[PDB]
Amino acid sequence: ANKTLFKTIDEYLLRAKDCIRGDTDTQYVCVEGTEQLIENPCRLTQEAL
Amino acid sequence: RVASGAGLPTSRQTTIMVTKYSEKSPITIPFELSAACLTYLRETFEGTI
Secondary structure (H helix, E strand, C coil): CCCCHHHHHHHHHHCCCECEECCCCCCEECCCCCCCCECCCHHHHCCCC | CCCCCCCCCCCCCCCCCCCCCCCCCCCCCCCCCCHHHHHHHHCCCCCCC
16 A cells, blocks of 8 residues: 555545445445445555544 | 335335225213103293292
């Protein structure tokens, strides 16, 4: 992921988003399209809060 | 309905039909009169004051 600044923020906008299925009690990863991707700013900064 | 982009399932037409019903709630109030009232309403004994 260590591209230049603007390519990095574009890759953050497009790629760096996960998805979790919202039907179930436990968190499962979803496939593209079924339900929208989740923004996670921790992925850019690489920190936990 | 909203048109779908590539990779996402398009939404089908639906027709939804429901029914509603009335309700009933009668009310009652009595009033009563004494036989003396019914006598004196019609009958004028000798016509004095």
